[PDB]
Structure formats: C-alpha cells, structure tokens
Write a structure and sequence with these properties.
heterodimer; A: about 450 residues; mainly alpha; globular; B: about 90 residues; mainly beta; Immunoglobulin-like; five-stranded antiparallel beta sheet; three-stranded antiparallel beta sheet; 8 strands; binds cesium ion
C-alpha cells in the first residue's frame, strides 16, 4: 500500500544500445500520410464552402476505430517472428487481410447507413445543413474503408525489419496530391465533383497503397499466402477469431480518444465560442507531432511481442523501459516547445482557420496531460503491444474518460481560467495510467520471471 | 568428446502437466531421452523420448504442485549420449 507497483525503476543494465530506430520509420512514414490530409483540407479551398472534412474527421471514425483492431496484429506477426513461417503468420496475414476487407466492407457498409447528419440538437460545426456536396465525400470517400483496411493490414505485416511503407506511403501522398485536385476541378479528368472529389481523389490513392502491399511480395521470401483466405474449422475458424479479442479491446480503447473527440468538441459552444474553438489549432497540434511520439511504441510494440517468441523474456520487457523512456526523453524535452510556443506568423490560415487575434489558454494543457500521457499509452503499445494485455487494457480506458466524466463539467463551473480545468481529472484521469498500466509492466516484466522458467544454461 | 543440449526453459505448466521448451540445433544422429522425476528421491524417474530437433517438447505432468526435476539427453555419432542437462522447477 506504498508501492503495489513493485520493483519500479529497474529496466536497466547497459541498454544504451536498444536500437529500435527503424521502429520510428514505422511512424515517419506516418507523417507521410497524416500529411496528404491537409493538402486537400487546403486543396478543397479552391471551393470555399469546401469545409469538406465535414465527413473526413467524422469518417475517420470507423477508420481509426476499426484500425485499432487491425494495427492489433503487430504482436501476432512480430511474435511469430520468433517462430518460422511468415505463411502461417501469413495464413493469418491473409485471414486478417480477409478481415482487412471483411471488416473493411463494414467500414465500407456501416459508412452507408452513416449518412444522415440531417439531424439536430445543438450549435454550428455539429447540426445545420443546406448545401451538402458532402453527400459524396461520404461515399466517393466512404466506399474506400474496404481497400483501406488491407492497406493497413499492410504495416501490420511491416513487423519484422521493413519500413518499405515509408518507401510507398510517401510516393503515395504525392501521387494523391496531383490526383487530388484533378477531381476538384481538373483536366481531361472527370473534372467536376470537387467538394467530395478531393475525397474520391484521396480514396483513389488508398486503393493504390492497398497494392503498395501487392507490390512488396518483392524484395525477399514471401508474405503471400493469399490462397482462398476462407476460415471454417469449428463453429467459426480462429487465427481470425483470435484477432477478435486483440480487436474489441483495441478499437473500443481507440474509443477513448473517440470520446476525446466528443469532449474536446463539446467545449467550444457554451457562451465560450471564440478562442474555445481555437482549442483545436491547439489539440490538432496534439494529433500532429503527438503521432511521431505516441507511435514509437505502436512501432516499438514489435520489438517486444517479437522478442517473446524470440525467447528473450524481458530481454524485451526490460527494453520496454529503455525505449519507454528514450522518446520519453523528448516526451518532456519537447513538452518544452509545447506549452512554450504558439500559432505565430508561421500559422497563416491552414488546417482549421483561426490564427491572427486569439488567446494562449491553449498551451495550458500542452503540459497538463501532455508528457504525463505522451508515453502512458506507448505503455499499452507494449502491453497490448507485448502481450494479450489489451484484454481489459480496454478498461485501462473505461477510466481515462469515466475518470474524465466530471473534468468535463469542471471548466463549466470553474475557479479560475479553467480552460485547462476539465483537463483536471482528465490530466489526473490521464496519469492514473502512470499507474494502471506500467502497473501491469511490473506485474508484467515480472511475468517474464514466471514465464522464464530456467534462468540460463551451460557450455 | 563434447557438452550438453545446452539451453534451459519450462515456460508454463498446464499445472497438472507442463511444457518443456529446450534447445535442439538440428539433432545429432538424433535422439533424446528425457528423465521423469521429482527431486523427491521416491516416485521413480520415468521416460519420455523424442526425435528431430525436438527437445522443444511437453510432459504428462500427472501429480499436483510438487517439485519436479527433469533432464534431457543428447544422442549422436556414437549411438550413446553427448551430454545431459536439467532444471527442477515444478507445478
Ligand atoms: Cs490522439
């Protein structure tokens, strides 16, 4: 009852040389795709009522939420990289690429049901509607979430020495941007539908980086067992049913930051209108270079699950520190330039226009939650990311939101400039992960005693 | 003229039975014997036996939580044994 998180610090020997630097080029290719993104936010500005994201950040609902499921394989296929067969890691790498198109045709069918924002209960940027050329980004860009799941199954088989996605998802963006505007209005091209057709154009390049997979059964021995990807063997064949509860717990836990989308976007329109909606040139600068952060461990989450088959029990989970804390070096030594700097005159009028004449009550959470979370789910990308342990890691997250229910109506009821004050027990909801998890990363690298059942050998 | 099947690991039981996941870099001529006792001294030693690069095997671990100790056995060139190795950590 002083520390029921046991032998804390020790994740150290001479680990200075834990070199998962190619597990950052798992997410420097993710600035590469995070960044077509705005060159059609500000490409479909040619059209001015092309505020068009109007679906595109409420489509990336059943992208990144089904995504979790899919990026939930990174164990599966790293972990059996201390087995032998990429083709039974690939009869999975298929059975999922079935999923990665099976759930992908729900991405692609649930999107259908979707389109009835023809609805109302409160303020603008969440009800109104007269002219919707959104109608069709809702479909010319909601028809993709099939070919777009296999085109993430992809890096869910980058788990074993390649970042030949940083290769493609960079030539991907650039082939899109030319192609992006062709439809907004273009050449010989179908040159018309543009407010939607940025999106027909973006989703164009999904299907193209869906066969940036096909185009890499290319530089070495296979990952292609795409024989009939079917299943049946019991009532429902696993290596599939297996991904199931690496699935539910991932997405539904990507469904923290999924309500952190109906939180941060339900506190701009009390009487707070003005710079309380510019709490998003802020929190989209969370997204922005929170990604390369965050996702070092959702890139690291290999060199841990991978090195459990490769039977090094915490010769991984005590590198699950030495990488926990190494961008955690820059988790805090650039939470520095976060609460520090602002939208100066480098910010003209880009991703969500509001730069010249508003407040900094916005860098006030650029520390709050910022480094006391930075990492605290790059924990899970080595919990989940190592083990089973997203099972109720899930309920990691049934707190970081239900612990953060009342630091909702805790700016609206406040003591001072409480802008960052519903970021109260939602930066304290959000460092009871500095416990809950790296609590099970020392129940847990202390299961790689219990697991490592002979301590060494002879000569 | 050599030394043992020289890795050691038992990851989990099925705490009646148990997995025994140990070295085998090829074989030799090839063969394995694997002892089958507690460290009690009573309850005689018994025998499992395997082939290929297959000391990476698993037990019938009948009896309960009690301390168990078990070794495996090279077999090579001379139809005899090229060295043995054990740990003892039970249910
Ligand atoms: Cs996020």
């Amino acid at each position: 009852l002083d520390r029921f998180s046991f032998s804390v610090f020790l994740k150290e020997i001479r680990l200075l040389t834990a070199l998962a630097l190619p597990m950052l080029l798992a997410q420097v290719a993710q600035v590469g795709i995070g960044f077509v993104d705005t060159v059609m936010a500000g490409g479909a500005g040619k059209e001015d009522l092309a505020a068009v994201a109007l679906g595109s950040s409420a489509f990336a609902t059943v992208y990144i939420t089904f995504m979790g499921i899919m990026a939930a394989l990174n164990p599966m296929i790293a972990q059996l990289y201390g087995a032998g067969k990429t083709g039974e890691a690939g009869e999975t790498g298929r059975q999922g690429i079935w999923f990665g198109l099976i759930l992908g045709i729900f991405g692609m069918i649930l999107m259908w049901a979707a389109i009835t924002p023809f609805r109302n209960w409160l303020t603008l940027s969440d009800y109104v509607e007269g002219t919707m050329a959104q109608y069709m980004l809702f479909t010319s860009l909601a028809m993709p979430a099939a070919m777009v799941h296999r085109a993430l199954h992809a890096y869910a088989s980058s788990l074993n020495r390649p970042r030949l996605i940083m290769l493609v998802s960079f030539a991907a963006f650039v082939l899109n941007v030319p192609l992006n505007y062709i439809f907004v209005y273009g050449k010989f091209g179908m040159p018309a539908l543009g407010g939607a057709g940025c999106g027909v154009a973006t989703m164009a390049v999904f299907w193209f980086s869906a066969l940036a997979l096909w185009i890499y059964i290319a530089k070495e021995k296979f990952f292609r067992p795409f024989g009939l990807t079917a299943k049946f063997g019991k009532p429902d064949w696993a290596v599939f049913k297996q991904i199931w509860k690496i699935g539910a717990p991932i997405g539904l836990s990507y469904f923290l930051e999924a309500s952190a989308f109906s939180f941060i976007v339900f506190l701009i329109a009390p009487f707070g209108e003005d710079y309380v909606a510019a709490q998003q040139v802020g929190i989209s600068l969370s997204g922005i270079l929170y990604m390369i952060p965050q996702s070092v461990g959702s890139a690291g989450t290999v060199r841990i699950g991978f090195s459990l088959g490769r039977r090094e029990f915490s010769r991984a989970r005590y590198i699950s520190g030495v990488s926990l804390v190494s961008g955690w070096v820059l988790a805090v030594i650039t939470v520095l330039s976060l609460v520090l700097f602002r939208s100066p005159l480098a910010s003209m009028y880009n991703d969500d226009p509001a730069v010249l004449s508003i407040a900094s009550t916005v860098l006030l959470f650029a520390g709050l939650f910022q480094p006391a979370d930075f990492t605290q789910c790059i924990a899970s990308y080595a919990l989940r990311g190592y083990k089973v342990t997203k099972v109720p890691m899930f309920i990691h997250a049934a707190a970081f939101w239900g612990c953060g229910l009342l630091p909702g109506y805790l700016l609206a009821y406040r003591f001072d400039m409480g802008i960052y004050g519903f970021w109260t027990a939602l930066i304290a909801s959000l460092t009871i992960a500095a416990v809950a998890l790296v609590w099970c990363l020392e129940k847990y690298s202390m299961e790689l005693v219990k697991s490592h059942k002979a301590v060494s050998s002879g000569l | 003229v050599s030394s043992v099947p020289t890795k050691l690991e038992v990851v989990a039981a099925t705490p009646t039975s148990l997995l025994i996941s140990w070295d085998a870099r090829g074989e030799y001529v090839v063969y394995y014997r694997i002892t089958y006792g507690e460290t009690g001294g009573n309850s005689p030693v018994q025998e499992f036996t395997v082939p290929g690069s297959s000391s990476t095997a698993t037990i019938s671990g009948l009896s309960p939580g009690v301390d168990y100790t078990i070794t495996v056995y090279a077999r090579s060139y001379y139809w005899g044994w090229y060295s043995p190795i054990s740990i003892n950590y039970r249910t």
